[PDB]
Design a protein around this ligand. Structure first.
Ligand SMILES: Nc1nc2c(ncn2[C@@H]2O[C@H](COP(=O)(O)OP(=O)(O)O)[C@@H](O)[C@H]2O)c(=O)[nH]1
Ligand code: NA
Ligand code: NA
Length: 423
């Protein structure tokens, strides 16, 4: 049946590398090997709706996605190493050759030449019942930040009735790109006007989670980092792909989170993170872990104040526990002073657990602690802007020094709005 379709757009090196973990997770959950595009079997094929992310074809299943970048090596070396040629096909690749050089303005301007080709690929493979788009990118670089902001502005303008949701990767506590404060403020300022929901991550928290919650002995490639982002994307969309007592789509979750038009910046968290922990935990254990800063995928100093949260229960869930613990959540977890004791929670329940897991809870939190995370970016921004450092290559690419003051002021307004609701 038509409807519920979603198109994903991967921009830059990070956005495409995260894309491998996401599509590997989607295929595994739908009993599909990503190598031959086939069903693994008919006996293990479950009552589901593969059409959310997958496109059915005679040879097999393909992703409803676009793999976009301003240089060809990050995507190609990914497909060669992981052997994704049959799935990450050439017809889904929008590549160019010049690169963005970690400059948001260059990625924005250069990406404008690929917009006509991107639209035509969308205008063909898109069902008119498509419910929205997901844009996967990093904010500290150039292509994911600049071109990604461009695809956010474009799609929201091109398809006003559809949801445009961003999954954005913040720089680590110490940025591994010196230009990141410029690229992050420009991206966040752009997404605040054209995006419906911005789900944020950073590598410091992702690394902390992998080392402390999964106990990996080493992290050698980003695949041992990006699987957390793919787990969030797959689990928050699980009710759209499998049976459940309580389903929810993209804009349903967005409408429950965005209290004020500017409060669209979300912090995700998942618990548990190993198989053996899903079998001995309770719904109260997982929810408490999700609301604990040790499980936030954004590096935060504390629990903060929750404005509004979306909770997805997957798998072997006791419904009576999920509802009875709501008073414990409202009493133990700090919420914004304006949140009524009976509000701030949006529930989703899916009978399909993540692969090999007994159960799992995914949290999407609209937290005032975003003001603290954003104030760090602004402080890094001002340290460079007040000294006129690295501004020439942004001015030479269309972004005036006045424009950098425009995006920064509007970015500071977002901080103060989150500050004011906090009390
Ligand atoms: N989590 C994650 N972060 C990444 C990945 N690749 C790059 N980054 C981060 O993104 C920033 C660099 O942006 P990048 O995507 O490499 O440049 P771009 O191709 O111009 O978008 C740095 O802060 C990196 O730490 C990835 O695969 N996973
Ligand atoms: Na790059
Ligand atoms: Na790069």
């Amino acid at each position: 049946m038509p409807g519920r379709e979603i198109l994903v757009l991967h921009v830059g090196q990070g956005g495409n590398q995260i894309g491998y973990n996401f599509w590997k997770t989607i295929c595994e959950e739908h009993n599909i090997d990503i190598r031959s595009n086939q069903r693994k079997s008919v006996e293990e094929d479950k009552v589901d709706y593969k059409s959310v992310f997958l496109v059915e074809a005679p040879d097999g299943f393909h992703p409803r996605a676009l793999f976009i970048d301003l240089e060809p090596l990050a995507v190609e070396f990914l497909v060669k190493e992981m052997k994704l040629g049959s799935f990450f096909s050439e017809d889904l690749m929008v590549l160019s050759y010049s690169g963005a050089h970690n400059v948001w303005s260059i990625g924005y301007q250069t990406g404008k030449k690929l917009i006509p080709v991107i639209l035509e690929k969308i205008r063909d493979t898109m069902p008119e019942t498509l419910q929205g788009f997901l844009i996967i990118h990093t904010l500290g670089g150039g292509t994911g930040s600049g071109f990604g902001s461009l695809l956010t502005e474009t799609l929201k303008k091109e398809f006003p009735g559809k949801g445009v949701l961003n999954f954005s990767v913040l720089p680590s506590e110490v940025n591994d790109v010196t230009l990141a404060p410029y690229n992050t403020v420009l991206s966040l300022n752009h997404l605040s006007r054209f995006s419906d929901l911005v789900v944020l991550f950073d590598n410091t928290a992702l690394i902390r989670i992998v080392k402390d919650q999964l106990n990996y002995p080493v992290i050698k490639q980003f695949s041992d980092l990006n699987f957390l982002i793919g787990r969030v994307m797959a689990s928050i969309t699980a009710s759209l792909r499998f049976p459940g007592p309580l389903n929810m789509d993209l804009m349903e979750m967005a409408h429950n989170l965005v209290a004020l038009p500017e409060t669209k910046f979300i912090i995700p968290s998942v618990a548990p993170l190993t198989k053996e922990e899903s079998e001995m935990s309770t719904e109260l254990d997982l929810v408490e872990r999700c609301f604990d800063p040790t499980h936030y995928m954004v590096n935060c100093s504390g629990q903060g104040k929750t404005i509004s949260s979306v909770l997805m229960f997957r798998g072997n869930i006791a419904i009576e526990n999920a509802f009875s613990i709501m008073t414990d959540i409202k009493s133990n977890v700090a919420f914004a002073p304006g949140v009524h004791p009976d509000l701030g929670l949006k529930y989703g329940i899916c009978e399909s657990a993540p692969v090999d897991f007994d159960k799992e809870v995914t949290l999407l939190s609209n937290n005032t602690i975003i003001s603290e995370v954003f104030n760090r970016v602004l402080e890094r921004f001002d340290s460079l802007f007040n000294r006129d450092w690295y501004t020439s290559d942004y001015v030479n690419a269309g972004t005036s020094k006045s424009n950098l003051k425009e995006a920064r002021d509007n970015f500071d307004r977002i901080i103060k709005i989150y500050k004011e609701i906090e009390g």
